Amino acid sequence: MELILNEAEKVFAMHGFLGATLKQIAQNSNVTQALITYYYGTKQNLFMEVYRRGLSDIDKKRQNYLDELKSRPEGYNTYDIVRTYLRPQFEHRQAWMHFARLQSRLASEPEEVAVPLRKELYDHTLKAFIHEIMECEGEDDAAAVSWGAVFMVSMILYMLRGVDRIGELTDGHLHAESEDDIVERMTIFITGGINSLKQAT
Amino acid sequence: MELILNEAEKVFAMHGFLGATLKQIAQNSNVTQALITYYYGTKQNLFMEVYRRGLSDIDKKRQNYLDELKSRPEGYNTYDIVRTYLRPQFEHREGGQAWMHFARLQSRLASEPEEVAVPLRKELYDHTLKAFIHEIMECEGEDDAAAVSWGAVFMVSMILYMLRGVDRIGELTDGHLHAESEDDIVERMTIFITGGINSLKQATQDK
Numbered sequence A: 001m002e003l004i005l006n007e008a009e010k011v012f013a014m015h016g017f018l019g020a021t022l023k024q025i026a027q028n029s030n031v032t033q034a035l036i037t038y039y040y041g042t043k044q045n046l047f048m049e050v051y052r053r054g055l056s057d058i059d060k061k062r063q064n065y066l067d068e069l070k071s072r073p074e075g076y077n078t079y080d081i082v083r084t085y086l087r088p089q090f091e092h093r094q095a096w097m098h099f100a101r102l103q104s105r106l107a108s109e110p111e112e113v114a115v116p117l118r119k120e121l122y123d124h125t126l127k128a129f130i131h132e133i134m135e136c137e138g139e140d141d142a143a144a145v146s147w148g149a150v151f152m153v154s155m156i157l158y159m160l161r162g163v164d165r166i167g168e169l170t171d172g173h174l175h176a177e178s179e180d181d182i183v184e185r186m187t188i189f190i191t192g193g194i195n196s197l198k199q200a201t
Numbered sequence B: 001m002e003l004i005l006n007e008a009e010k011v012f013a014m015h016g017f018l019g020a021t022l023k024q025i026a027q028n029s030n031v032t033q034a035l036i037t038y039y040y041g042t043k044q045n046l047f048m049e050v051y052r053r054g055l056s057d058i059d060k061k062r063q064n065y066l067d068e069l070k071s072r073p074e075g076y077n078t079y080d081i082v083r084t085y086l087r088p089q090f091e092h093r094e095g096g097q098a099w100m101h102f103a104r105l106q107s108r109l110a111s112e113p114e115e116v117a118v119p120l121r122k123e124l125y126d127h128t129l130k131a132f133i134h135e136i137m138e139c140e141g142e143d144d145a146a147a148v149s150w151g152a153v154f155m156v157s158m159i160l161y162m163l164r165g166v167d168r169i170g171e172l173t174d175g176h177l178h179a180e181s182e183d184d185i186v187e188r189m190t191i192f193i194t195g196g197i198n199s200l201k202q203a204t205q206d207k
Helices: A002-019 A020-031 A033-040 A044-067 A079-088 A096-104 A112-133 A141-161 A165-169 A181-200 B004-019 B022-031 B033-040 B043-070 B078-090 B099-106 B116-136 B145-162 B166-171 B180-200
Strands: none
Touching: A002 A020, A002 A033, A002 A044, A002 A096, A002 B004, A020 B043, A020 B166, A033 A044, A044 A079, A044 A096, A044 A112, A079 A096, A079 A141, A079 B099, A096 A141, A096 B004, A112 B166, A141 A181, A141 B145, A141 B166, A141 B180, A165 B145, A181 B145, A181 B180, B004 B022, B004 B033, B004 B043, B004 B099, B022 B033, B022 B043, B033 B099, B033 B116, B043 B078, B043 B099, B043 B116, B078 B116, B078 B145, B078 B180, B099 B145, B116 B145, B145 B180
């Protein structure tokens, strides 16, 4: 159960969907291919499962951060929503690493798996996230928010790569202090970006 | 030398660096592996060459567009610079095979291993990004290197993702919204990037 998913997570992050084999996944779990086929059916299904588990934990925490927000006496704003969506991707506990790496390669996966992935696991919550921003007091431009959400995803997928790109570009002078610094900077950036799109329409 | 490279680019775009083989590239090129090896050294160096040719066309365009900027009498701002950097990644001749393959290839860059991925940043992307940051650093009110530098990293992330050609906006608006055109895409990223640079800048000052 949990062993086979963890090892398959590792092997997919490393080789992508096509490159991975159940042969390799069986070897690192000490089981037969047969037993996997039994539990999971097809390489695609196993792959979907790895994503179901990963994104189930993240969206549960997203939902908890959103419930806390909607319980504040003072209310909330766009900034708060964006930060709500981002933290769960970045708050770690090598559990965290492999799913982060895996997600970061999503764009190079075949449409045969990417399209169902997006439709079944990401769309629902992104739409929900967009709707929440529409409910806020700055916002009745769906265009600005929806584009902003597309740009968010691109930022998330890249940041999940774990590359210290800011370090590489500033000859070491600038670094991300932490995951919360990364989240904070993306939150501000996106919130401002959404605003500029709204203010130019 | 403009043929093995075109085949290499196709195979690399479809299969990635690890999955591509010099064997298939040679078969699709109607030459031997040995001849490919003779001109290009190693699979890692063919790959680099595919990206050298590609980013050379792109960066020469960027340099012309920034030159055009610096010759406008009324001047230019952050927005104009950002547009400069984005344009050659998205403007294409239509139906534009050369642009398509290289777009697709660059879109997959995140899934390449560090043995090609790191040299590509080092050798091919850094110089032009640093120059980009510098040019923006000469447009007051803008003396926040952090704001602009994070802006650039977030620039790049949206480029690599948009190059995939996935109608993400469509999927999320159940069809109600789409890119009108390449220029509409560039336009939207530029305003987003410029605004975001501002919000980062505006969050640093104030005690």
